[PDB]
Amino acid sequence: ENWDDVEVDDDFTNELKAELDRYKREN
Amino acid sequence: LHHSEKKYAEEDQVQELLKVLNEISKTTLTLDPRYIWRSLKDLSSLRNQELLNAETLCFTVNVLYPDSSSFKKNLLKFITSNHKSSVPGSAELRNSYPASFYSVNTEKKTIEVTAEINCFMHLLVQLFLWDSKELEQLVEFNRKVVIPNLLCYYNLRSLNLINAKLWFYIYLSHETLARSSEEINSDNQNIILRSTMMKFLKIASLKHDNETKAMLINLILRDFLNNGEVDSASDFISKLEYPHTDVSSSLEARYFFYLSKINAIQLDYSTANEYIIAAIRKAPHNSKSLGFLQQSNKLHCCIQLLMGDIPELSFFHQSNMQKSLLPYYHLTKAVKLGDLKKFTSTITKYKQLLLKDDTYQLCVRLRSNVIKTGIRIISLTYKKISLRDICLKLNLDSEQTVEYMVSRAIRDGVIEAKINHEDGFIETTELLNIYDSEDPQQVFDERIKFANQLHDEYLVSMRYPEDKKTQQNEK
């Protein structure tokens, strides 16, 4: 549980789906 | 009913007293009474609750009373005692026997029995006081008597261990009196107590008693924390009179616990980090030591956060004490992430809890440590980063502010980088590749010193108990 389970993650949830926005528009 | 109650408990007390009486009468053996006195504290705590207070009344009747005539009456006056016809002169366990403290030779004053009696008499007094939790005049009445009695006796080799445990009750009863009620008389009462500690410590310095000085140093260093004098603590630890040989493991953990808090204000955590770790390894894991393990772990988490390095994260969840370690997790999270508003609201809710352990002042200094740690995190991510790119992350004030905070971080050799203002970016001067330098050789030399250190102590610890088995006759 070193540097993993203690702070969990709390990221890459709604920001992962938001990446496809700039991919399907600017391109 | 009450007649048979006094004979049962007193016989068990005399049975334990006669065992240590013949041990000190033959040559010099200082470890024989010590093993019984360890269990005596636990056995007397449960025995004092049973059969009320009537077990210690006839004990004063049995042996001759040098000072104890009026001491037992004043102890029973506060509780408004009833008269059971316990007046001395009824129960007689002596009956003219050599191990019974023969009376005729004692009354004629041709022999001195006061050494092994009066010194042991003060031990049973402090045990009953801690069970009933008596305060105010009863605390000062006992302390005033014991001090002249210790100065009158010569404090022999076996006499130094009798009062060694009495100092712990003197300091404990005085601190609980000040926290319960504060007055002007309690302040001047501690002035005399500070002088008594130094007078007895000088006498014990000649005998070089290991257990006696171990109890004093723990009480003297703790008194300096309430008095607030560093010069008294700094000069005290400079002599290094604390023996590491025969002192108990519980007394060792208390010694290293003070050095961590003393070195914490000197802004040098190199030596203080080892004392807080060694104090945990020398502290038992039982339930009675849980109070020390709780306070020691609270200081350990604060030392690492003040060094600019994140401690072990799994230490909180693996232990079962994390209920009180929850405030320290939000302190580490606020410093690592680098949020300015999160740190302000973190110490606000727990501000009431941080006042008891006096760790709130170390939490105020964590405000600067948020930036000190944040610079080290962003420096490892980007070796070359522009000036305005850092302010967009930690939401700092201006560009000149972040430029001058990096030069302060390299003062202690943390970041180890350079700032180029003409080019406009900060470049890291650490290329690693330390395998070609002599720096790891200095650390490897200490590992050999640590390995051979336990080798010499291995022959001392293992061979010593085998000395008695050679002289004793075997089948």
């Binding site: - | 990096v406 030399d445 010193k449």
Partner: protein, 180 residues
């Protein structure tokens, strides 16, 4: 502990003592008495006399001189009673600034250092360059990062030249003690 002492000169003399420890750079008694007082909250925050040296020392090691220098010049309480210590406190900062420009900068222009040292003239910066022996090139100040003889104290620990000889001696000495 004495709770009956209330006066305007009591909090002033205690505040002047904290500025005296920072003048000589004393890390012993300055970081100690903060926890030894009666009020660890109201007197160390709401009171501007006791919190004056606290905000300076906290912002000194922080590295931000923008808001730290304002208390030593434009402050409210630095006029009369605190002005005596402003000479050394501002001198202790510029002594650290001179040592920070050596390691983190090879060369710096005279125009940008004028704002950091809070000087109103370029000749004032060059005045301390000759006293401290700073190499000076055109429109720049060169820093060669000159050190002293050996380091610190405690001989045969990170001190003199040829440390590998003592390292070999550490392997020979403690190896004989194995049999002993």
């Amino acid at each position: 502990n004495h709770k009956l002492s209330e006066s305007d000169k009591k909090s002033k003399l205690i505040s002047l003592y904290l500025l005296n420890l920072l003048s000589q750079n004393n890390t012993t008694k300055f970081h100690s008495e903060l926890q030894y007082l009666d009020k660890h909250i109201k007197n160390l925050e709401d009171d501007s006399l006791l919190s004056y040296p606290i905000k300076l020392d906290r912002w000194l090691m922080e590295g931000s001189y923008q808001k730290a220098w304002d208390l030593l010049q434009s402050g409210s309480q630095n006029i009369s009673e605190f002005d005596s210590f402003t000479d050394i406190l501002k001198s202790a900062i510029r002594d650290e600034i001179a040592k920070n420009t050596e390691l983190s900068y090879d060369f710096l222009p005279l125009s940008n250092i004028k704002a950091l040292l809070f000087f109103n003239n370029e000749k004032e910066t060059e005045k301390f360059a000759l006293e401290r022996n700073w190499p000076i090139v055109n429109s720049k100040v060169y820093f060669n990062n000159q050190s002293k003889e050996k380091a610190d104290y405690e001989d045969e620990m990170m001190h003199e030249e040829d440390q590998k000889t003592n390292i070999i001696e550490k392997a020979m000495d403690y190896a004989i003690s194995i049999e002993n």
